[PDB]
Amino acid sequence: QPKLYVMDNGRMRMDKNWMIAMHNPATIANPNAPTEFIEFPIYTVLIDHPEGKILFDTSCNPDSMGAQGRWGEATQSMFPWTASEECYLHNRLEQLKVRPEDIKFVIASHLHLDHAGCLEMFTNATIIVHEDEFSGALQTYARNQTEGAYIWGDIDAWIKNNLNWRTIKRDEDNIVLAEGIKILNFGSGHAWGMLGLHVQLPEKGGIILASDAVYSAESYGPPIKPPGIIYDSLGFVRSVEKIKRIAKETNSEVWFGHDSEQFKRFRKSTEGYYE
Amino acid sequence: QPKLYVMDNGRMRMDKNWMIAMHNPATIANPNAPTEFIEFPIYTVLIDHPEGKILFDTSCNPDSMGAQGRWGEATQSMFPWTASEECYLHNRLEQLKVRPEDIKFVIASHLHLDHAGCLEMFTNATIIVHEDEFSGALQTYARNQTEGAYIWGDIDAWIKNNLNWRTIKRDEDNIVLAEGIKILNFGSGHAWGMLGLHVQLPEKGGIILASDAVYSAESYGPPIKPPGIIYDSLGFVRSVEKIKRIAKETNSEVWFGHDSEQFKRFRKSTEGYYE
Ligand SMILES: [Co+2]
Ligand SMILES: [Co+2]
Ligand SMILES: [Co+2]
């Protein structure tokens, strides 16, 4: 019988306009409306499953921040990540007696800086990613980009570590990984290719791991509120409505990528698990 | 030998984040980055062509602003329009001794509040609009929305006044209206359905009227910088690159929807015309 762990991998801050587009627009009375710098959790999910350990997302690389960090200067100042050492993925896994080598499957929701940071560690896993997301990230790597949400140094390491990739084709959906574990293909929206996960736990029932397909309850609505910069705005909305439909049809809880208040109510890996 | 006039129809102000998404994002050094209320012009173009007069866009309705205005309260405070009576479209057309009934074709780039405000004056003209733009605005009407970029009161009057609509089908493109005058179908992007115009003038050469498909030189780039909220982001980028391609292949100049510095340099209808 599977156990599912929520691992706390620190906090990030950014302009709220990135999370909720035009959340507070200028008006005649407030022509110089100040934005704000919200904080939100970064997290990862481990499913300790009889058929093999599954990891959903991988958080940020420990070498992300600082003068010698992988993230570019402007990226560090716009999306600072604060994490104590216990928050690093390898530490969180170690405290559960789980070594990187023990992971059979890693689902990369997408290849942004806060979800793909530690892919390089899982050299024995099959790494599951959307084919267009994989293609889009590799192109940014070939153009040698120092700034942005795709980290050159992270991608460099994935290639050097020769990860065993399995790309999800753009017309593939509902891919059964193990009993009660199903990959959901949301396609393009927030990024080129978003994957989610549906988990059926014997006791707790259905869970949908949405990652950045839905940032928060405010994004989810109604009304649906899209992020400030969006790759495929139509796809984004269509993906949110697909999540809602699946949630309703399967009586599933939806776990957002970065909701401070939802995350607060999760039992974390320091305290236990869901079964 | 056709003449082309540029009619100044006033100025509008709004949060710059509407024009250029995430122009000045929050940082650690500046967590409450203030936005800015920017000013830009609203304008329309009349082509005096021997085969018939042609109007491109129609600015805002004189009854838009104020306590009794058609624009919702929030809309007025986020997108205030300023204009003296001489800026009104019926007054610009009068100063040129052209009567609304003379106009053979009115091109509605799209049906937003600052481009479709005076469609109701043109009861004899053929009103050309993208079929999905028409559908979309009509839905907002049926839903009685009092706020937003589609104006319930304006749509009301279009229906009351029984306009002669010609919808451009979503697969139609390069529709010849008269010698040297061609409708360009950009499709979804900024709105559900964008139309531009290509104008071949004997002396001045090629002119592309982009309207809201490209706000300004900063939007055009490169790099292309999208608006802050955007209906169809992929569509938006596709249309800009189509505008670039056509401008290159025809050696045409691109007239943006709302570029202050470009507009400053145009020859207004008070001073003369292009030929
Ligand atoms: Co992301
Ligand atoms: Co994220
Ligand atoms: Co406009």
Residue numbers in the entry:
A (entry chain C), B (entry chain I): 9 to 283
Sentences from the paper on this structure:
AaL (WP_021296945.1) is a lactonase isolated from the acidophilic, moderately thermostable bacterium Alicyclobacillus acidoterrestris. The quorum quenching lactonase AaL from the thermoacidophilic bacterium Alicyclobacillus acidoterrestris exhibits a very broad substrate range, being capable of hydrolyzing short and long chain AHLs with high proficiencies. AaL possesses a bi-metallic active site center. The crystal structure of AaL reveals a unique hydrophobic patch which could relate to its high specificity, and highlights a flexible active site loop which may be involved in substrate binding.
AaL was also crystallized bound to a glycerol molecule. Glycerol may originate from the cryoprotectant solution that contains glycerol. The molecule interact through two of its alcohol groups with the metal cations and with D122. In fact, an alcohol group is bridged with the α-metal, D122 and D220 at 2.0, 2.6 and 2.7 Å respectively and the second alcohol interacts with the β-metal (1.9 Å). Surprisingly, whereas the metal coordination is very similar to other lactonases from the MLL family (AiiA, AiiB, AidC) and the PLL family (SsoPox, SisLac, VmoLac), and the good resolution of the structure (2.15 Å), the putative metal cation-bridging water molecule is not visible in the electronic density maps. It is however difficult to conclude whether this molecule is present or not, since the observation of this water molecule can be difficult because of the strong density peaks corresponding to both metal cations, and the conserved coordination suggests that the conserved bridging water is present in AaL. When compared to the AaL structure bound to phosphate, both structures align very well, with the exception of the 237-loop. Additionally, the metal coordination is slightly different in the two structures. Indeed, the distance between the two metal cations is bigger in the glycerol bound structure, as compared to the phosphate bound one (4.0 Å and 3.5 Å, respectively). This lead to a shift in the position of the residues H120, H123, H266 and D220 which coordinates the metals.
